Amino acid sequence: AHSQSLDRLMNPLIDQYLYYLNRTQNQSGSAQNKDLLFSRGSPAGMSVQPKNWLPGPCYRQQRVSKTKTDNNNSNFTWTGASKYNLNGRESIINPGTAMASHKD
Amino acid sequence: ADGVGNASGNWHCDSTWLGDRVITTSTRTWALPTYNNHLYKQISSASTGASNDNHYFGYSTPWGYFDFNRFHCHFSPRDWQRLINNNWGFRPKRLNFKLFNIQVKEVTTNDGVTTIANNLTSTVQVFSDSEYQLPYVLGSAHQGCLPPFPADVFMIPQYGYLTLNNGSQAVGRSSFYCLEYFPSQMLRTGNNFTFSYTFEEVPFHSSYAHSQSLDRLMNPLIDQYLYYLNRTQNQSGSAQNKDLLFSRGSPAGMSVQPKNWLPGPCYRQQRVSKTKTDNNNSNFTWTGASKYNLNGRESIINPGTAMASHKDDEDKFFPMSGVMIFGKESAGASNTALDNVMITDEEEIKATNPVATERFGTVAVNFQSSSTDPATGDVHAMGALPGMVWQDRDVYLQGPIWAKIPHTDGHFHPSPLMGGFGLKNPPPQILIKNTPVPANPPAEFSATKFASFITQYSTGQVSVEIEWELQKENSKRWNPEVQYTSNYAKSANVDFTVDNNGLYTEPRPIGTRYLTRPL
Amino acid sequence: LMGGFGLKNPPPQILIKNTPVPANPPAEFSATKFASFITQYSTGQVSVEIEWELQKENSKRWNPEVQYTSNYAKSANVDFTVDNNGLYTEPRPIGTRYLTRPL
């Protein structure tokens, strides 16, 4: 497994030299006025910080809980399935694109 | 090995143009503080009030590191001009790195009097991570690279890294690295350090624009032999009747004419005007952003897919997260005004590449029939299709050179999105640290770790030599090219110069794309 | 026009500088250029050696030439010497044109 994640590859101690658009309206005190304000990538901002890479491809699938009571009451295995259409004939995509089974 | 009184290296800043090669050499003088009082520290987003998207876990290190990964570390503005006006491409070939003329200095403070003196017997430790065994922090576009201007003295940045995090906590799979657990050379004031590196084979960066566009590749004088469906109802005079009418591709119809190729991939971004009054009144930078979702944690896509910044005569618009933005020397760190930043313009690639702020195109979303009208929908994000061609993002004199390609099962076109050369085995990280020098220990043994050290720092010179390979321009074009030029008119300052206070500034970004090539 | 030898490729400019020596940097990184340095200066010796070619005087002139000479009479100081405070002075310009040649 990777001991790092794509979005965390930066040095946590150092600012970037690249700027991003931080705010389209200034705060002031009175009212919100249109503005263009720019910040450079910092460690506090890792989510807005420019990066070189993208996560892999995605074909979304329906989420189902191992606890019965959480799931919708219906049989959705076919009707809610991720499927491909080949020669007018449907086939469930399975296991499909390699993707993480769940988040943290 | 040299003594106290002998210099261990000479100053070399030069650029040599020979044939298809140019060799850049740059020497800078550096200063290395002690970081973290010689300690490794767990660092985290804990108790920062961070949003879920901003959480991190990692370590700060006592070590510093050298970063030469930007183009102005190597090319002067004039040299950059020679490159971009005369060449269709270029790539890095080999690398040479040297540290020399080391001075370690101890700092003593009594009352408000700081005294600095040579410590001749102290060392610094240096190693390159050649096997890529450390988290690779280069290629995130951090500041702390060699200064553009050779007379500037720069401070060495502190090395740190991140590992897997769940919120502000760690996971048993998170890695900790001690840099003292590598071998490293120890240098007193007479010692020097060197190593060399060879770049792997990479494509030439394309420094040129296409003189054609994908949809204009046909002969304007000649019809095709292919037919397309022109009309589904005939005009007649009385009323519109269902019909099937076919025309062959002609010069009047270039838009409906069958073609072999598709424009490159597209991930649409929000359009924002450089004139405040045009934009919506709201703060949409986060809520309207193009973002990716990784482990329940959002990250803005930026600069993202290489796309044209604007279409014809829309130059006032730019992609919100989709362009490289450099700060001027007058820019603050946060919420600085537009006049303090320099927004790059990717316009040259609109020949093959979608405009960043527009849809890729339209798709049929249904089955039409006599009962139901044909419906279409906009494609705002389009992945790779067979037949797509595209240009990569341009590089810039103050932009980055390389990035490390992540080590993964799969890649698609692993060109770094901020621009430059994707490398499986990039130039290695070069790590440097002042060796701890204990203060006077107590007269009876204690097993407790020393917290008490002589304050010191180090300084020296660093040289980087890069050989670049050039791709010459073969064009048969009759008329003159567009060239990068300085303005001939008078002004108060000269571009890319110091001012009367000694401050070197860079007036604007300079891309590589001037010369042209047929498509 | 001020006199001397016009040279396409003259003796080159020789440039010298004290290498900057930063003072103690802060404990946290800053990307700002160092403004703080240890004050220092340098001193040494310099030698210049020039070989000159001479053109000898071939004259058949019978009578004595005009010569540059120092005055033989007594005076308080000697020309081209230091004074009692150690100050070296040059009393006058000395040109090169004394010997003669036919035209």
PDB file of C-alpha atoms in Angstrom, chain B residues 17-132:
ATOM      1  CA  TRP B  17      25.439  27.075 -26.578  1.00  0.00           C
ATOM      2  CA  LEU B  18      27.025  24.377 -28.756  1.00  0.00           C
ATOM      3  CA  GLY B  19      25.191  22.799 -31.655  1.00  0.00           C
ATOM      4  CA  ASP B  20      22.001  21.214 -30.373  1.00  0.00           C
ATOM      5  CA  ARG B  21      23.142  21.433 -26.741  1.00  0.00           C
ATOM      6  CA  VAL B  22      23.019  24.260 -24.240  1.00  0.00           C
ATOM      7  CA  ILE B  23      24.733  23.857 -20.880  1.00  0.00           C
ATOM      8  CA  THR B  24      23.621  26.065 -18.009  1.00  0.00           C
ATOM      9  CA  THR B  25      25.665  26.508 -14.851  1.00  0.00           C
ATOM     10  CA  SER B  26      24.549  28.481 -11.827  1.00  0.00           C
ATOM     11  CA  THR B  27      26.291  29.174  -8.535  1.00  0.00           C
ATOM     12  CA  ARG B  28      24.521  30.594  -5.502  1.00  0.00           C
ATOM     13  CA  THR B  29      25.514  31.260  -1.924  1.00  0.00           C
ATOM     14  CA  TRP B  30      23.350  29.653   0.746  1.00  0.00           C
ATOM     15  CA  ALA B  31      22.750  29.790   4.488  1.00  0.00           C
ATOM     16  CA  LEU B  32      21.600  26.824   6.577  1.00  0.00           C
ATOM     17  CA  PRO B  33      20.078  27.319  10.036  1.00  0.00           C
ATOM     18  CA  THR B  34      19.553  24.688  12.650  1.00  0.00           C
ATOM     19  CA  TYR B  35      15.946  23.513  12.368  1.00  0.00           C
ATOM     20  CA  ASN B  36      13.752  22.200  15.204  1.00  0.00           C
ATOM     21  CA  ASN B  37      16.693  22.373  17.636  1.00  0.00           C
ATOM     22  CA  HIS B  38      18.028  19.168  16.047  1.00  0.00           C
ATOM     23  CA  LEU B  39      14.724  17.379  16.608  1.00  0.00           C
ATOM     24  CA  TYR B  40      12.220  15.365  14.627  1.00  0.00           C
ATOM     25  CA  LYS B  41       8.667  16.447  15.378  1.00  0.00           C
ATOM     26  CA  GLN B  42       5.312  14.862  14.768  1.00  0.00           C
ATOM     27  CA  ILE B  43       3.208  17.508  13.045  1.00  0.00           C
ATOM     28  CA  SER B  44      -0.509  17.356  12.453  1.00  0.00           C
ATOM     29  CA  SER B  45      -3.576  19.403  11.683  1.00  0.00           C
ATOM     30  CA  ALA B  46      -4.836  18.585  15.190  1.00  0.00           C
ATOM     31  CA  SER B  47      -6.107  21.565  17.201  1.00  0.00           C
ATOM     32  CA  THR B  48      -5.803  23.805  14.142  1.00  0.00           C
ATOM     33  CA  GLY B  49      -9.550  23.963  13.587  1.00  0.00           C
ATOM     34  CA  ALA B  50      -8.898  22.612  10.106  1.00  0.00           C
ATOM     35  CA  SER B  51     -11.696  21.569   7.808  1.00  0.00           C
ATOM     36  CA  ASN B  52     -11.891  17.890   6.940  1.00  0.00           C
ATOM     37  CA  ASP B  53     -10.383  18.698   3.544  1.00  0.00           C
ATOM     38  CA  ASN B  54      -7.280  20.222   5.163  1.00  0.00           C
ATOM     39  CA  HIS B  55      -6.314  17.491   7.666  1.00  0.00           C
ATOM     40  CA  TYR B  56      -2.807  16.068   7.588  1.00  0.00           C
ATOM     41  CA  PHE B  57      -0.342  14.017   9.599  1.00  0.00           C
ATOM     42  CA  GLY B  58       3.400  14.039   9.190  1.00  0.00           C
ATOM     43  CA  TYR B  59       6.815  14.928  10.491  1.00  0.00           C
ATOM     44  CA  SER B  60       9.136  17.893  10.473  1.00  0.00           C
ATOM     45  CA  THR B  61      12.816  17.097  10.159  1.00  0.00           C
ATOM     46  CA  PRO B  62      16.022  18.778  11.368  1.00  0.00           C
ATOM     47  CA  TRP B  63      17.320  18.598   7.783  1.00  0.00           C
ATOM     48  CA  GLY B  64      17.277  21.116   4.978  1.00  0.00           C
ATOM     49  CA  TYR B  65      17.214  20.392   1.286  1.00  0.00           C
ATOM     50  CA  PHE B  66      18.343  21.919  -1.988  1.00  0.00           C
ATOM     51  CA  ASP B  67      15.746  22.670  -4.642  1.00  0.00           C
ATOM     52  CA  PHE B  68      16.840  23.848  -8.087  1.00  0.00           C
ATOM     53  CA  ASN B  69      13.600  22.834  -9.819  1.00  0.00           C
ATOM     54  CA  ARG B  70      12.531  26.012 -11.634  1.00  0.00           C
ATOM     55  CA  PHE B  71      13.747  27.304 -14.980  1.00  0.00           C
ATOM     56  CA  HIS B  72      15.053  30.642 -13.822  1.00  0.00           C
ATOM     57  CA  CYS B  73      17.461  28.749 -11.555  1.00  0.00           C
ATOM     58  CA  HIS B  74      19.315  27.961 -14.765  1.00  0.00           C
ATOM     59  CA  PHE B  75      18.401  30.168 -17.732  1.00  0.00           C
ATOM     60  CA  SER B  76      18.846  33.907 -17.582  1.00  0.00           C
ATOM     61  CA  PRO B  77      16.067  35.934 -19.230  1.00  0.00           C
ATOM     62  CA  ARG B  78      18.261  36.489 -22.291  1.00  0.00           C
ATOM     63  CA  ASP B  79      19.099  32.775 -22.388  1.00  0.00           C
ATOM     64  CA  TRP B  80      15.416  31.951 -22.115  1.00  0.00           C
ATOM     65  CA  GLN B  81      14.803  34.246 -25.081  1.00  0.00           C
ATOM     66  CA  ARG B  82      17.430  32.453 -27.164  1.00  0.00           C
ATOM     67  CA  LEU B  83      15.784  29.149 -26.317  1.00  0.00           C
ATOM     68  CA  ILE B  84      12.190  30.062 -27.091  1.00  0.00           C
ATOM     69  CA  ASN B  85      12.759  32.088 -30.249  1.00  0.00           C
ATOM     70  CA  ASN B  86      15.017  29.579 -31.975  1.00  0.00           C
ATOM     71  CA  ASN B  87      13.884  26.110 -30.945  1.00  0.00           C
ATOM     72  CA  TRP B  88      10.938  23.782 -31.388  1.00  0.00           C
ATOM     73  CA  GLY B  89      11.799  21.828 -28.260  1.00  0.00           C
ATOM     74  CA  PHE B  90      14.257  20.965 -25.544  1.00  0.00           C
ATOM     75  CA  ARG B  91      14.722  18.493 -22.717  1.00  0.00           C
ATOM     76  CA  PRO B  92      17.139  17.975 -19.823  1.00  0.00           C
ATOM     77  CA  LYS B  93      19.956  15.478 -20.369  1.00  0.00           C
ATOM     78  CA  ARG B  94      22.386  15.319 -17.452  1.00  0.00           C
ATOM     79  CA  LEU B  95      23.036  17.093 -14.186  1.00  0.00           C
ATOM     80  CA  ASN B  96      26.007  18.031 -12.026  1.00  0.00           C
ATOM     81  CA  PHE B  97      25.724  19.288  -8.445  1.00  0.00           C
ATOM     82  CA  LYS B  98      28.404  20.666  -6.128  1.00  0.00           C
ATOM     83  CA  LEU B  99      28.625  22.016  -2.584  1.00  0.00           C
ATOM     84  CA  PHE B 100      31.830  23.738  -1.544  1.00  0.00           C
ATOM     85  CA  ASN B 101      33.413  26.545   0.488  1.00  0.00           C
ATOM     86  CA  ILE B 102      31.617  25.413   3.628  1.00  0.00           C
ATOM     87  CA  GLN B 103      31.721  27.763   6.610  1.00  0.00           C
ATOM     88  CA  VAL B 104      30.209  26.693   9.919  1.00  0.00           C
ATOM     89  CA  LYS B 105      29.674  29.541  12.365  1.00  0.00           C
ATOM     90  CA  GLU B 106      28.730  29.499  16.037  1.00  0.00           C
ATOM     91  CA  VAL B 107      26.473  32.178  17.505  1.00  0.00           C
ATOM     92  CA  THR B 108      26.834  33.439  21.072  1.00  0.00           C
ATOM     93  CA  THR B 109      24.490  35.904  22.766  1.00  0.00           C
ATOM     94  CA  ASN B 110      25.318  37.835  25.937  1.00  0.00           C
ATOM     95  CA  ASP B 111      22.909  40.597  26.958  1.00  0.00           C
ATOM     96  CA  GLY B 112      21.698  41.968  23.612  1.00  0.00           C
ATOM     97  CA  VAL B 113      25.047  41.353  21.917  1.00  0.00           C
ATOM     98  CA  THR B 114      25.100  38.585  19.317  1.00  0.00           C
ATOM     99  CA  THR B 115      28.610  37.421  18.434  1.00  0.00           C
ATOM    100  CA  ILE B 116      29.408  35.222  15.433  1.00  0.00           C
ATOM    101  CA  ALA B 117      32.643  33.250  15.141  1.00  0.00           C
ATOM    102  CA  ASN B 118      34.055  30.491  12.984  1.00  0.00           C
ATOM    103  CA  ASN B 119      33.834  26.983  14.338  1.00  0.00           C
ATOM    104  CA  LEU B 120      36.512  25.278  12.295  1.00  0.00           C
ATOM    105  CA  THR B 121      35.930  21.737  13.559  1.00  0.00           C
ATOM    106  CA  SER B 122      32.154  21.566  13.051  1.00  0.00           C
ATOM    107  CA  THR B 123      30.603  19.610  10.205  1.00  0.00           C
ATOM    108  CA  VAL B 124      27.562  19.599   7.984  1.00  0.00           C
ATOM    109  CA  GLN B 125      26.007  16.370   6.741  1.00  0.00           C
ATOM    110  CA  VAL B 126      24.945  15.897   3.136  1.00  0.00           C
ATOM    111  CA  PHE B 127      23.437  13.042   1.219  1.00  0.00           C
ATOM    112  CA  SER B 128      21.352  12.615  -1.882  1.00  0.00           C
ATOM    113  CA  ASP B 129      18.516  10.112  -1.764  1.00  0.00           C
ATOM    114  CA  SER B 130      19.412   8.209  -4.896  1.00  0.00           C
ATOM    115  CA  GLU B 131      17.066   5.276  -4.375  1.00  0.00           C
ATOM    116  CA  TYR B 132      13.991   7.455  -3.801  1.00  0.00           C
TER     117      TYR B 132
END
